Design a protein around this ligand. Structure first.
Ligand SMILES: Nc1ncnc2c1ncn2[C@@H]1O[C@H](COP(=O)(O)OP(=O)(O)O)[C@@H](O)[C@H]1O
Ligand SMILES: Nc1ncnc2c1ncn2[C@@H]1O[C@H](COP(=O)(O)OP(=O)(O)O)[C@@H](O)[C@H]1O
Ligand SMILES: Nc1ncnc2c1ncn2[C@@H]1O[C@H](COP(=O)(O)OP(=O)(O)O)[C@@H](O)[C@H]1O
Ligand SMILES: [Mg+2]
Ligand SMILES: [Mg+2]
Ligand SMILES: [Mg+2]
Lengths: 154, 523, 535, 154
């Protein structure tokens, strides 16, 4: 969405929406835009039937309040000491990209990094500026590695 | 829009490329083939600056032409490489390459792959070399008459043949005066110590080689002597004047006496400098930089003659001739660096202009050649001919071997290859013979320029070379008959022939491997 | 369009896919005619009139101008193959293009691209695993013969083809002369430390190998000697010019009597340095900076050679070879400046040679270590440049063979064996990956076809014969030795290429397969193109 | 800690770096909220089902709007069925039928090519992703519904 140049003022808000998700979650950047488009599409028939936009907004708020409760009731608690769940979550988040074939190499590394930066007993958030990514041409994707030290380019 | 992939690059491929390359090479060869042999005619060309080049040399013709087809560029380049390597034979190489490339399309059009032709040519080149070395003749370099004969045989084709016995001598002397051995065992005949000075006017018979050097300069002050009998010469690389340093120097004065004081010290500096020269008691001072007037005053008081602003090349030649060496600080001037090998210094006028001659050296290792003539173009052609002659002399001095001229070597090698080819089987037999029959374009051309019947003379010569000992028979390029090169006396060095054959065959091999062309690709 | 105001152009669906494939195909069609001992060369002319003659895939693809991304990908693939290995930069493009074409043929049918990608990955992994059965240990063979055959095989199809034996011996000697003595865990062979110089003139059979080093430089002044028998060499990294004070320092004079002694000092300091160098018996001085004419006279009087404006890398190689030490200053661990005799190199001879109207410098028989250089003679500049480009490939191939002790037959034995094996192995999967594996196996077969087509032979029959022989090799174990029968192009028949002496490093095949598969996978995933308008 | 990323091209290197960032942000989300949920389109179809049931309770125009909200949540499963070459109508009907009679972890299996339990395939995702996506989408739609004019300025 950022690389294109959308000209319509409405379509210039959707991109911002995706940005917000990237800040909050880092995943689901496509799904939020799909959902927003679907809701705005459904609003057309309601407008034609003679509904007022204010009533539509209030009903959407009510539906959101119910949906959050339903989703929360769906969930299942997890503990950081179980590495299998973290590996499954990472490999699920990773099997939609070009590097899915290398997941059996990239899935553990990621997890390792997050467990080498935080203190699991009191971790309430993670600072990703403590993990540095270095891009080096040559070789194949099968050559990515994790360095527990310092890497310099000069 | 305009969906593209390569941005207006032009591509060609197929047999059309090979045919075009061969045609371009033959077209290049066609311009020149009238300038081979002692009956050649000249050509005049106009350069982008308005001058005129009336010449007969193949390289001098080819390097004045602008062309677009790359094959022509390759041919011009091989011409200039032949000129640089040995200095002679820049016409026969072009014709030979053209013929060897022409006799290949007959096989290319009969569904034969180029690699087979390449292998056959490379196989034939080695046998050409061996046969050339087989019929060689040694020469004794201490016999001056034989060396004059070789040089003359080299210059009977050019425009100065009318004065051959003159030019020959000149060339020989020059080379004999530059051969030089130094620390180690390295011998050199470097040709940057044999300078050719041209002065229009007079007559050509007055041209000579000086035992010394000649410069276009005059004495700095009129009272300096213009005629010294046995001078002692010092050469300087520095300036005899007061200059500024480079360390960001400034002066701040507050007293009355300082200013004048400073202006005096400069002069004092000059004085001691001049003294450091006068302590060696010389007669001539030569420098590449300027000379101040106060220095001229002191030197004249010491009875010295000074010259200014001579080029570095001229200073090096003077150092090599008189026997001195160049000094940049007078305080480190010794007696060993003073040249005492000269025999005369004179300053003359040659047509409203002053020239300086340093002549009568005891044993100079550098010389100068003074040419007179009608105008600039004639003197330029004479200069080119002298360059050819001196290069031939150097080649024969570095490799004392000789081979017959007039077409004897070509027919001998062709007969040897023809006799050897009947011991082989396979397709490569047919290209292998072709190059052999491509060596007969040298005698044929000669005959065509003499105005004789090539169809009968060529078959008579071929029949003559079939016999057992007739390896020196050739064509008399002035009358149009068959004659033995032993009696006519046309011999040429082996190095020139080897280079000619190698360059021609390798150019053919290079041009036979192209298969497509891509153009306009923006670097 | 209507929706999605984008002020650009959007393409979607099979259209773009087909377009992409065509682009790749075009690139292959440029180089398909320069493969094998029978293929020919190309001539490239720019807008101003420079001519380049070559049949190197990397050079051709680098000199061309391209703008379709699907072709720039292949150009960068060729560059990467050149950097990592140094050989086989033409075959990798052909392999990648054929893989892409065969995959698009399946994707036109309703086969999902992910299945094709997974099948390609599986086939590549299994092929790389299986190649390690076709290996030959070069120590089992006679080492010199294996090295010579590898170099001569690499040199075929180049301008130095028929001269394979002469240049092969030269290359092997030059490579062996550079072997360095590491920790001794493994030896190392730093090629491109061997200098290559070009000079047109005599035939190419007069190219020479120098046991020492060659400098494209000349002596500083014409008064110096030009041959030293027993050479003591001092390498310097600073200019010998009259000293000037730095930016901070300036001269202010209030008493005139003190001026003159200042101006002498600028000309004296540098002199005091030169004597310190010359007092230890140094004969040859090499400098990366300049040397003033005032300072050349000291060397001239002392009878010594001085060369200025020497390249840094040449100085490093000379100093390492002769045992000297590079100095950027004379200062020691005390306040003063000294030059010791223990930081001098020794060479057995230093000459200034003349080659075809120019001059250069030879340093022969260095004593600390052995070094090499090559001088190449040819008809003109285009020919010499092509020979240098050809020789680089052979040097790299010999280096790879020495470092990794394994060789593989050539001519198409590997492609035929892998095609047969993968076609057989695809039966066990029994899924939609079977089709992708079969297409991988069929796409591997384009190399022998191109080799036979360039030779104007019957490609179909020859490839059928190869496949039949290798099938008889894979079953019937008593005939296992049929996995080496390659291809003979000068007669049009198979021949045992292991005994014939056609070899190549296995790393070439491995890296080519891996890189080609990666490129095909990364291009096979695009279903939408958006091209924005210029600003 | 440092990660060194290798590849044969610039484009694949960039995509690999983006994928690794995706996985890292997913693990960070798991750290922030210790909760897990099933993927594969299950949350959207269950949301649509429960909101359709909830719509019957409400009375008046509001009810219509709630129903529309539900019908805007089945776009995600349908898309997932379309991209895999499956029949969307049958797949979504079977999903709704299986979610309406008990188990709430059913989803689309692309390996099997049908509908099955999703936890048996080990595809899971955090809850924060879904909650944040829904909340941001609803807020953006409510913001869009407030606009009734466009003015061109300098
Ligand atoms: N193996 C799988 N089987 C079925 N669905 C999957 C699988 N992996 C991921 N998904 C689904 O893909 C959806 C989003 O994938 P993705 O393309 O990354 O979109 P986003 O970037 O918006 O998360 C998720 O809802 C998840 O349920
Ligand atoms: N008197 C002569 N009779 C026959 N041939 C001659 C005679 N003089 C020179 N030649 C031949 O002319 C050729 C030299 O050609 P020339 O026109 O001088 O240009 P180039 O030397 O560059 O080929 C030599 O091969 C030589 O054999
Ligand atoms: N003597 C030979 N006989 C048969 N095939 C050969 C021979 N020499 C080289 N080849 C083949 O030529 C191919 C290499 O072609 P080449 O022009 O060197 O380009 P590149 O190696 O860069 O792809 C190899 O696959 C090899 O099998
Ligand atoms: Mg995602
Ligand atoms: Mg001549
Ligand atoms: Mg190759």
């Amino acid at each position: 969405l950022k690389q294109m140049q959308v000209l319509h003022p409405a379509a210039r808000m959707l991109v911002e929406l995706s940005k917000a998700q990237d800040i909050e979650a880092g995943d689901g950047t496509t799904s939020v835009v799909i959902i927003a488009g679907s809701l705005l599409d459904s609003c057309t028939k309601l407008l034609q039937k003679g509904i007022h936009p204010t009533i539509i907004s209030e009903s959407f708020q009510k539906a959101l309040e119910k949906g959050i409760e339903i989703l929360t009731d769906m969930s299942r608690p997890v503990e950081l000491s179980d590495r299998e769940t973290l590996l499954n979550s990472a490999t699920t988040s990773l099997n939609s990209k070009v590097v899915s074939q290398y997941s059996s190499l990239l899935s553990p590394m990621s997890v390792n990094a997050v467990m080498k930066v935080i203190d699991p007993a009191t971790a309430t958030s993670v600072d990703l500026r403590d993990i540095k990514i270095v891009k080096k041409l040559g070789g194949t994707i099968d050559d990515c590695e994790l360095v527990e030290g310092l890497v310099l380019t000069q | 829009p305009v969906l593209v992939l390569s941005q207006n690059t032009k591509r060609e491929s197929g047999r059309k490329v090979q045919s075009g390359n061969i045609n371009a090479a033959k077209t290049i060869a066609d311009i020149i083939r009238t300038c081979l042999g002692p009956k050649s005619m000249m050509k005049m060309l106009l350069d982008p600056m308005g001058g005129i080049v009336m010449t007969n040399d193949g390289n001098a013709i080819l390097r004045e032409i602008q062309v677009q087809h790359p094959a022509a560029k390759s041919m011009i380049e091989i011409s200039r490489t032949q000129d640089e390597e040995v200095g002679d034979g820049t016409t026969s190489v072009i014709i030979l390459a053209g013929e060897m490339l022409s006799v290949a399309e007959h096989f290319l059009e009969q569904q034969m792959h180029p690699t087979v032709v390449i292998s056959a040519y490379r196989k034939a080149l080695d046998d050409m070399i061996s046969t050339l070395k087989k019929i060689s003749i040694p020469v004794d370099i201490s016999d001056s008459d034989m060396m004059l004969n070789i040089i003359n045989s080299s210059i009977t084709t050019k425009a100065i043949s009318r004065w051959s016995s003159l030019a020959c001598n000149i060339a020989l002397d020059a080379v004999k005066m530059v051969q030089f051995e130094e620390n180690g065992r390295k011998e050199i005949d470097i040709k940057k110590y044999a300078r050719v000075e041209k002065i229009p006017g007079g007559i050509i018979e007055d041209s000579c080689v000086l035992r010394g050097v000649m410069i276009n300069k005059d004495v700095t002050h009129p009272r300096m002597r213009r005629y010294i009998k046995n001078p002692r010469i010092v050469l300087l690389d520095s300036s005899l004047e007061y200059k500024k340093g480079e360390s960001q120097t400034d002066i701040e004065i507050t007293r009355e006496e300082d200013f004048t004081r400073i202006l005096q010290m400069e002069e004092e500096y000059i004085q001691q400098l001049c003294e450091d020269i006068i302590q060696l008691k010389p007669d001539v001072v030569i420098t590449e930089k300027g000379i101040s007037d106060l220095a001229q005053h002191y030197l004249m008081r010491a009875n010295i003659t000074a010259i200014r602003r001579v080029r570095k090349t001229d200073n090096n030649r003077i150092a090599r001739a008189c026997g001195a060496r160049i000094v940049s600080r007078p305080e480190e001037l010794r007696e060993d660096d003073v040249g005492t090998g000269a025999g005369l210094l004179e300053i003359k006028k040659i047509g409203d202009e002053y020239f300086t001659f340093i002549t009568d050296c005891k044993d100079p290792k550098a010389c100068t050649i003074l040419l007179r003539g009608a105008s600039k173009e004639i003197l330029s052609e004479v200069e080119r001919n002298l360059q050819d002659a001196m290069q031939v002399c150097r080649n024969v001095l570095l490799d004392p071997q000789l081979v017959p001229g007039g077409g004897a070597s070509e027919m001998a090698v062709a007969h040897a290859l023809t006799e050897k080819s009947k011991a082989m089987t396979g397709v490569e037999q047919w290209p292998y013979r072709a190059v052999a029959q491509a060596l007969e374009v040298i005698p044929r051309t000669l005959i065509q320029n003499c105005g004789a019947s090539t169809i009968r003379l060529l078959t008579s010569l071929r029949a003559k070379h079939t016999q057992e000992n007739c390896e020196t028979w050739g064509v008399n390029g002035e009358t149009g008959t068959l004659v033995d090169m032993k009696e006519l006396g046309i011999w040429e060095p082996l190095a020139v022939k080897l280079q000619t054959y190698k360059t021609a065959v390798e150019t053919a091999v290079l041009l036979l491997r192209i298969d497509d062309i891509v153009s306009g690709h923006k670097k | 369009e209507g929706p999605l105001s984008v002020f650009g152009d959007r393409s979607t669906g099979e259209t773009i896919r087909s377009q992409n494939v065509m682009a790749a195909a075009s690139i292959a069609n440029i180089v398909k005619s320069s493969l094998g001992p029978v293929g020919l060369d190309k001539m490239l002319v720019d807008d101003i009139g420079d001519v380049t003659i070559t049949n190197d895939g990397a050079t051709i693809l680098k000199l061309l101008e391209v703008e379709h991304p699907a072709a720039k990908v292949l150009c960068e693939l060729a560059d990467l193959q050149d950097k990592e290995v140094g050989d086989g930069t033409t075959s990798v493009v052909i392999i990648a293009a054929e893989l892409l074409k065969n995959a698009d043929e399946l994707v036109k049918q309703k086969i999902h691209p992910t299945s094709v990608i997974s099948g390609y990955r599986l086939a590549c992994k299994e092929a790389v695993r299986y190649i390690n059965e076709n290996l030959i240990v070069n120590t089992d063979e006679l080492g010199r013969d294996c090295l010579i055959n590898a170099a001569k095989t690499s040199m075929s199809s180049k301008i130095i083809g028929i001269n394979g034996d002469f240049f092969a011996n030269m290359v092997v000697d030059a490579v062996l002369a550079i072997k360095y003595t590491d920790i001794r865990g493994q030896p190392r062979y730093p090629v491109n430390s061997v200098n290559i110089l070009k000079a047109h003139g005599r035939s190419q059979m007069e190219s020479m190998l120098i046991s020492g080093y060659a400098l494209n430089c000349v002596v500083g002044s014409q008064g110096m000697p030009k041959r030293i028998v027993n050479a003591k060499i001092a390498c310097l990294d600073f200019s010998l010019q009259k000293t000037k004070m730095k930016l901070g320092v300036q001269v202010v004079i209030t008493d005139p009597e003190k001026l003159d002694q200042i101006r002498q000092r600028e000309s004296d300091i540098t002199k005091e340095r030169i004597q310190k160098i010359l007092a230890t018996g140094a004969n040859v001085i090499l400098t990366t900076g300049g040397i003033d004419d005032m300072c050349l006279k000291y060397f001239v009087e002392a009878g010594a050679m001085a060369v200025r404006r020497v390249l840094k890398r040449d100085l490093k190689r000379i100093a390492k070879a002769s045992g000297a030490t590079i100095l950027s200053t004379l200062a020691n661990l005390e306040g003063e400046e000294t030059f010791e005799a223990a930081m001098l190199g020794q060479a057995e001879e230093v000459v200034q040679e003349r080659i075809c109207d120019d001059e250069l410098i030879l340093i022969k028989n260095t004593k600390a270590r052995t070094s090499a250089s090559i001088i190449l003679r040819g008809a003109n500049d285009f020919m010499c440049d092509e020979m240098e480009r050809s020789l680089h490939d052979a040097l790299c191939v010999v280096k790879r063979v020495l470092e990794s002790k394994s060789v593989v037959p050539g001519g198409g034995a590997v492609e035929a064996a892998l095609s047969i094996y993968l076609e057989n192995y695809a039966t066990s999967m029994g899924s939609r990956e079977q089709l992708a594996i079969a297409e991988f196996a069929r796409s591997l077969l384009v190399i022998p076809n191109t080799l036979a087509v360039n030779a104007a032979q019957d490609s179909t029959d020859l490839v059928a014969k190869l496949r039949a022989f290798h099938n008889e090799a894979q079953v019937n174990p008593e005939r296992k030795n049929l996995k080496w029968i390659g291809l003979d192009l000068s007669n049009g028949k198979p021949r045992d290429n292991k005994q014939a002496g056609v070899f190549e490093p296995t790393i070439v095949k491995v890296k080519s397969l891996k890189f080609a598969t990666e490129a095909a996978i990364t291009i096979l995933r695009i279903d939408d193109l958006i091209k924005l308008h210029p600003e | 800690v440092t990660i060194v990323v290798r590849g044969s091209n610039k484009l694949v290197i960039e995509e690999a770096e983006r994928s690794i960032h995706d996985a890292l942000c997913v693990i960070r989300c798991l750290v922030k909220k210790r909760a897990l949920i099933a993927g594969g389109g299950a949350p959207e179809i269950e949301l649509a089902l429960r909101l359709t049931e909830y719509s019957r309770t409400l009375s008046g125009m509001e009810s219509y709007c709630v129903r529309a909200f539900a019908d805007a949540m089945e776009v995600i499963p349908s898309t997932l069925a379309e991209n895999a070459g499956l029949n969307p109508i049958s797949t979504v009907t079977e999903l709704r039928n299986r979610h309406a009679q008990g188990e709430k972890t059913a989803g689309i299996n692309v390996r099997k090519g049908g509908i099955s339990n999703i936890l048996e395939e080990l595809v899971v995702q955090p809850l924060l992703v879904s909650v944040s996506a829904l909340t941001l989408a609803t807020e953006t739609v409510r913001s869009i519904l407030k606009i009734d004019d466009v003015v061109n300025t300098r």
